[PDB]
């Protein structure tokens, strides 16, 4: 079973914070509150590796007391004055911690974007369905509603808006479970079969999340799991890349690359036990290692939804929760950055699961 696997093959260590300590930990160890909230334009530093190394050099000239992606990921400090990243960014009102992004570029070459706020409308409004459409959709079965809403959908300064990878920062706490599916398949898989496969993936994943996070109320009915699906009603699919993003349950927060590696491993064992899941995903897929766990370490960058690869955009597939209460609200979260960023602000006491062994 999955209970036996989380009794014999995991050693969970959690530490409880409370009162001002919990709020301080959340503020210091996640992105700033305004970071992932939409903005008109973007402030931040975005350039190639050479240009960014040069500007970091010209930003440490102003850093007299102490002192490429290990360093961008390291510039996080505010105090009661403008933060230390305000020298690289040159904008004096940034607030830290702030997102750091790796950016593939045509024809080759890597760039970085360390920026505080950004218009996420420019990135997500081509796939943000109308509330009138969602309400007017007619479709009582949740599987059917999800499939139809899925049906309806539709310089570094230019390349970060079509290609973007969030870089994992081990100094930051983790408020979402961002999995990375790698579905190999000899035979193409029809879209409704895949949608049912995701619908059975979610309940095994939610059982795993319940096991790992005891003090919680993770309901396998309405807990929001956010699936995005790279395009290629099928993608004319012949590897399919998914992306499952989950809120870490409210009292908990995860710390450590090893810890989320373990979390992904436990969810993979949860899903490769659901007898109703290995029917759908089975008979098409060569392998069965459905999750890459070596993606969570300090410095690895994972592509973000509504972005392509240099080109299959991770546009959402709405695997709507069964017994979900507010469908418009659920549809209205695939576009918010805070549901698919590692280190987002979470949405009293907290518990940090800092070890699984």
């Amino acid at each position: 079973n999955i209970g036996e696997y989380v009794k014999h093959n995991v050693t969970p260590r959690e530490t409880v914070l409370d009162g001002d300590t919990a709020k301080a930990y959340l503020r210091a160890r996640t992105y700033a509150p305004g970071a992932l909230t939409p903005a008109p334009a973007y402030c931040g530093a975005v350039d190639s590796a050479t240009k960014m190394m040069g500007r970091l050099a010209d930003a440490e000239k102003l850093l007299v007391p102490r002192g490429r992606l290990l360093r961008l990921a390291a510039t996080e400090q505010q105090g009661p004055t403008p933060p230390a990243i305000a020298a690289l960014i040159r904008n004096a009102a940034v607030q830290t911690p702030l997102p750091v992004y790796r950016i593939s570029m045509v024809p080759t070459g890597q760039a970085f974007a360390a920026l505080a706020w950004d218009d996420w409308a420019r990135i997500t409004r081509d796939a943000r369905l109308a509330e009138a459409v969602v309400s007017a959709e007619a479709h009582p079965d949740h599987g059917a509603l999800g499939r139809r809403l899925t049906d309806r959908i539709r310089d570094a300064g230019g390349q970060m808006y079509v290609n973007r990878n969030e870089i994992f920062n081990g100094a930051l706490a983790i408020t979402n479970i961002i999995l990375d599916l790698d579905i190999a398949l000899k035979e193409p898989v029809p879209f409704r079969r895949l949608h049912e496969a995701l619908g059975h993936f979610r309940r095994g994943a939610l059982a795993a999340v319940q096991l790992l996070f005891p003090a919680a109320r993770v309901d396998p009915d309405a807990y929001p799991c956010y699936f995005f699906k790279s395009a290629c009603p099928v993608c004319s699919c012949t590897k399919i890349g998914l992306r499952v993003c989950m809120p870490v349950p409210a009292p908990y927060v995860v710390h450590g690359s090893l810890t989320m590696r373990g979390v992904a491993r436990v969810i993979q064992q949860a899903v490769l036990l659901d007898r109703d899941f290995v029917e759908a995903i089975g008979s098409y897929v060569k392998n069965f290692l459905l999750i890459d766990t070596g993606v969570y370490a300090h410095g690895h960058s994972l592509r973000l939804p509504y972005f392509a690869k240099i080109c299959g955009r991770l546009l959402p597939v709405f695997v709507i929760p069964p017994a979900c209460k507010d469908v418009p609200a659920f549809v209205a979260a695939h576009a918010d950055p805070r549901r698919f960023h590692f280190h987002a602000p979470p949405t009293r006491e907290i518990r940090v699961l800092h070890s699984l062994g």
Binding site: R13, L63, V352
Partner: protein
């Protein structure tokens, strides 16, 4: 030999020169005399080579008279040989008292002078109301342009203090004082003195604050001499550190004042900045050009000035007796010591056990613990044994020591001077030996009297000891205090060690629980009314004083259990400490540690151009950390990568673990050392 009743405010060293001489030299000394106005006289002294060597430590006179390059612009001569200047000033202050007579500061004085020569020949005590010593504020700040490269000087001398490096750089390149913006404000009220300096060379009044005076002397030398001085008016000393700022201000003062033909003073200063490895106490000695001290609470500074002729703290141990005169007096004071205490001194080792004491760890429970102290007992014994050994040695330094000893109970400044004087009066092994032996006999007397007045010593030194009883209780403690006082007095008088003021044994606490985990680490507690005491926990920073508070709270509760529950309280206390620490995870100076020039961090090159902040580092380096940052060498506020609270917390937790393991073993007998799981839990807060 005309006599006037005047009061000297400062004895400063004006000239040093050799006659047709080989084994001696002469000096001309400047008196800032006053009356009911001020006047400026001088005295001639004569110091031989033997006296110089005695005050030095064994060197030559031809080397204390070729420090007559100090009448020039090169302004940091004692940096070449600080001990030479200490010795010269002390030996001139001894020769002056030996030739003219008893000279004292701020006291009414009958002062003579030979009209043919002009110099003071004899000085005697007198009677009268002296002027109330005046003062003048001094806000000195300057921009000395010293090129970071200070890296070189610290490269030759690894553990050097950056104030010393700053002064050595100025000495290497003098014109940095002649091109340095400077802002000075002297407020005596009689005439306000602000000034404005783009470069110190470039342009009330200087005449409204001092008087330029020319006096015609004819010492015994080759011809008539004219000594020009700056006589203070309506103030006797400046009160304020930027020592290069003072040096540059006084150096341009010397240049402007003395650019006309007549002899120029010494222009020499001494401070803890002038030694490579610094000095724990700040001061700014003026033993040269200007004339009057610049003290760096001010009541204590003035009083220590008056008591020790202003030689302290520049001279050091030379206030009391020459350093080459200490073996003779130590052996003499041992000869006039009983044979038993002779042998006790003969076997004094800094680690030998005299009294059987509680072995760490130990715990005395609900009994009447005490904490007894003979205040300044080492100073009293030093003074008394020095009087006893004065047959081996003239006694004016002993008089200064005696005045400090008899003033210490009423003046805390005398206590501070004694606490910085006895540790350096010999540090000269014979005085360590004799003091240790006399203390050993005192410890034995405390033992022997305790065995009769219902007492048992459980720790301490002999001058600061604590112990338990066999018993209303206040009465027996009073009896023990009185009996031990009388016993130490009788045993001290048997050894002819006669103390200036009768021994007082202070009851520094009547406590009801005590736990000991090391040679100095002890915690005391009073259940009947919470009044603890904790000694031995390091206080190297604000984090350490918060840790001491945590440890004291924890020990209160843990002894309130009157062992696993004790471990629970200790671990929870560590929990709370780490949480509150993370609340202060960003404050740099909170996690700073003060490290001496003697314990082992590298100096980042950027710290080597923090400007004038480097000149306020004479003794301590205050470092946060895993890369170390000397916080005070940077402006404010500090941009900083998140301070490594793991390292600093591990430090603090190891001291707390010492304390807790000691307590657990002492009270209940648990051999298990208290170890906090830090990596297992609470390490993640700073990863």
């Amino acid at each position: 030999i005309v006599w006037v009743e005047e009061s000297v405010s400062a004895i400063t060293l004006y000239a040093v020169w050799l006659p047709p001489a080989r084994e001696y030299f002469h000096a001309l000394v400047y008196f800032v005399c006053r009356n009911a106005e001020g006047r400026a006289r001088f005295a001639e002294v004569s110091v031989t080579a033997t006296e110089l060597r005695d005050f030095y430590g064994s060197q030559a006179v031809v080397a204390a008279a070729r420090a007559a390059t100090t009448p020039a612009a090169s302004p940091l001569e004692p940096l070449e040989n600080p001990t030479l200047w200490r010795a010269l000033y002390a030996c001139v202050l001894a020769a002056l008292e030996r030739q003219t007579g008893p000279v004292a500061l701020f006291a009414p004085l009958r002062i003579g002078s030979d009209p043919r020569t002009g110099l003071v020949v004899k000085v005697e005590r007198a009677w009268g109301p002296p002027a109330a010593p005046r003062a003048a504020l001094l806000v000195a700040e300057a921009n000395i342009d010293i090129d970071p490269m200070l890296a070189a000087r610290v490269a030759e001398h690894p553990d050097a203090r950056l104030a010393w490096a700053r002064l050595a750089a100025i000495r290497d390149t003098p014109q940095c004082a002649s091109a340095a913006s400077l802002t000075v404000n002297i407020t005596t009220g009689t005439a306000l003195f602000a000034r404005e300096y783009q470069t110190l060379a470039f342009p009330g009044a200087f005449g409204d604050l001092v008087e330029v005076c020319e006096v015609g002397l004819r010492p015994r030398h080759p011809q008539r001499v004219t000594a020009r001085v700056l006589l203070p008016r309506d103030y006797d000393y400046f009160v304020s550190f930027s020592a290069p700022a003072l040096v540059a201000l006084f150096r341009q003062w010397h240049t402007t004042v003395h650019a006309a033909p007549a002899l120029a003073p010494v222009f020499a200063f001494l401070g803890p900045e002038f030694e490579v490895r610094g000095g724990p106490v700040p001061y700014f000695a003026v033993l040269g050009f200007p004339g009057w001290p610049t003290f760096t609470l001010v009541r204590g500074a003035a009083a220590a000035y008056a008591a020790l002729l202003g030689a302290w703290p520049a001279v050091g141990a030379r206030v009391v007796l020459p350093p080459r005169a200490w073996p003779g007096v130590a052996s003499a004071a041992a000869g006039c010591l009983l044979p038993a205490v002779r042998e006790a001194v003969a076997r004094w080792h800094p680690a030998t056990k005299i009294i059987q004491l509680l072995d760490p760890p130990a715990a005395v429970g609900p009994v009447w613990t005490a904490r007894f102290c003979f205040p300044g007992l080492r100073a009293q014994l030093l003074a008394a044994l020095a009087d006893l050994g004065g047959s081996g040695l003239g006694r004016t330094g002993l008089a200064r020591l005696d005045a400090l000893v008899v003033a210490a109970p009423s003046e805390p400044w005398a206590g501070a001077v004694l606490e910085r004087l006895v540790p350096d009066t010999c540090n000269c092994p014979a005085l360590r030996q004799l003091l240790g032996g006399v203390m050993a006999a005192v410890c034995l007397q405390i033992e022997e009297t305790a065995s009769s007045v219902k007492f048992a010593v459980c720790g301490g030194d002999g001058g600061a000891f604590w112990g338990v009883f066999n018993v209303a209780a206040s009465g027996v403690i009073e009896d023990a205090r009185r009996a031990i006082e009388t016993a130490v007095g009788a045993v001290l008088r048997a050894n002819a060690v006669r103390l200036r003021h009768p021994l007082c044994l202070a009851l520094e606490g009547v406590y009801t629980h005590a736990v000991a985990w090391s040679q100095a680490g002890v915690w005391f507690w009073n259940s009947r009314d919470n009044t603890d005491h904790l000694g031995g926990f390091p206080l190297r920073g604000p984090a350490y004083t918060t840790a001491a508070g945590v440890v004291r709270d924890t020990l209160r509760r843990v002894l309130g259990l009157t062992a696993l529950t004790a471990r629970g309280l200790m671990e929870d206390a560590c929990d709370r400490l780490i949480l509150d620490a993370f609340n202060k995870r960003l404050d740099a100076e909170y996690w700073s540690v003060r490290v001496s020039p003697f314990e082992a961090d590298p100096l980042p090159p950027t710290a080597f151009r923090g400007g004038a902040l480097l000149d306020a580092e004479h003794y301590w380096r205050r470092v946060v950390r895993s890369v170390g940052v000397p916080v005070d060498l940077y402006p404010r506020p500090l941009v900083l990568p998140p301070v490594d609270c793991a390292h600093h917390l591990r430090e603090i937790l190891r001291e707390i673990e010492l304390v807790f393991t000691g307590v657990l073993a002492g009270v209940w007998g648990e051999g298990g050392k208290f170890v906090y799981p830090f990596d297992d839990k609470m390490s993640f807060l700073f990863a």
